[PDB]
């Protein structure tokens, strides 16, 4: 790339840019079984 210019050449005073405008997301919520109303409908136990 070789460009030579005289005393004054235009296109030395330009500005171009694409800024980001932010990033968003969501946090998933976890539900538990015993907190629901379906827990008074059965008895939960566990055998290893």
């Amino acid at each position: 790339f070789f460009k030579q210019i005289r005393s004054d050449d235009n296109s030395l005073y330009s500005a171009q840019f694409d800024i980001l405008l932010g990033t968003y997301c969501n946090t998933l919520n976890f539900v538990r079984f015993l907190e629901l109303g379906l827990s008074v409908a059965c008895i939960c136990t566990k055998f290893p």
């Binding site: 800024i19 980001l20 405008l21 932010g22």
Partner: peptide
């Protein structure tokens, strides 16, 4: 934007429900 990643007044206005 940012470039730091290291890794009131009472106004009269009606309100309904």
């Amino acid at each position: 934007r940012g470039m730091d990643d290291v890794a009131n007044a009472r106004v009269p206005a009606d309100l309904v429900i």
